[PDB]
Amino acid sequence: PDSAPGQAAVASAYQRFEPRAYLRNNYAPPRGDLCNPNGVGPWKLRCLAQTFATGEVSGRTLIDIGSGPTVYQLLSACSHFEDITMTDFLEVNRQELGRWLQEEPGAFNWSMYSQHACLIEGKGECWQDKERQLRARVKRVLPIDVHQPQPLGAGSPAPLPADALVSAFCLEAVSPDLASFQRALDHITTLLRPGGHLLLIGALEESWYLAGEARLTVVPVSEEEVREALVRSGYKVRDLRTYIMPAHLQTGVDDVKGVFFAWAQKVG
Template identity: 30%
Template sequence: MDPSTYKRYHIHGHDTRQWMDHYFSDTAEMVFGEDVLVFPIKCLIKAFAAGKIKGDILLDISHGSVIHHLYSACECFKDIIVLKVDDRCIMELKRWVDKRTGAFHWGHAAKLHVDIEGKSNLLEDKDVKVRSSIQHVVKCDLEKENMTEPIVLPPADCIISVLLLDVISKDQDDYIRYLRKFSRLLKPGGHFILIEGLGITYYTVGKEKFHAFNHDEDFTRKALEREGFIIDECNIHKRTAVSDLVDYKAMIFIVAHKT
């Protein structure tokens, strides 16, 4: 397929449930668990356990309706505000938050968290804590100066972005432009946690292929530093999954703070 025909996530949208089934479920066919669940969850637990990343408001600006990264974050922030680019993502997330029939099952991610933390007895508390921490789910328009117009968000103590910058950006300039918009939502001294794929050019949902921006660790570091961030931690996890659904070469986890 000609890459120029690939769809764009924030423009065309896709079936968020099918995307999560492909890449985040607990089925036998889901081969990405080590890369997109175990690796970032281990990194997040370690990062939050250090006690430096905390505050009142956490903004989650991520791809689809994933919540696995919030199991650690919810312990360190009073309120979580989730920004989504499409109505389907909002509906899917609210279905889980409201415990409606047919919501995506995240039990395997919660179990990973408590097992890694050595707190298996707290498994039932994990979902309750995340649900109660998610105070607002807000639709955003990435092209507007104020992405949440007419709502004006308070400056965040921390932003987490999972697998979003690389799928909304068509090139280097786009990536930096969106990163700058995210940065404006963050307090000086606030933390930015970035989880994304490296060396990726496409991902598949159903029978459709979607564009992803191919970049490496060096570009990612320089983009953050150029926008006034100091990188506190950077971990790289080389791909273990065998699948042609997506072509990333590695996963990157970065914690940085805004000067």
């Protein structure tokens, strides 16, 4: 059928996306409490740490798809890639990342996340060093639209194809229905070299979340649907794990039932 209408709806909804509210909702306590090892925060970081610790995900360039105003998803990644590209649809998010990159006081504080990352990586690294290296290795912050066949546009900056892709809470959050999800996945897959790796994190069975005034509509997806999409796009699924959201972390910022983590390798 037609993809344009659904996309138009999504673009419109995101015009009201408030980064600060989003940050507060998902990365300040209770959800941003990294002290309880059973929490979603530590689980996400652990998934990323453990994956990179295999040494099997490495290369020169990495692209983060739909970064929004967050960097946690790159904390463990940055020691394995010399060149990192962050991306987002919204200017306001790219500016938010801009604040952090200039190490401004007005910037969101990720130090709890950096420290926890250092803690679990177990190399005795101090968090200031981890942050310094991430800031060094982020070579650009670019506009992206995953609904386009060329999500970064034509003749874009990013070194293509990338050795690896990271994406957290983007695809299912910007896709009206499963078919759109699949196409978005196909689009970003063109950015990844054959044999390259994708680390995908996302919400399970979620239909809405809040970003301030904006209450955005999300395609609820299951683990099996995520698996099948990955196979459909030419990936071998190396890892796919599920975190079930504890009642006490279900706070009304959304209706998320769980979180998935996928480590997939593009077939080459």
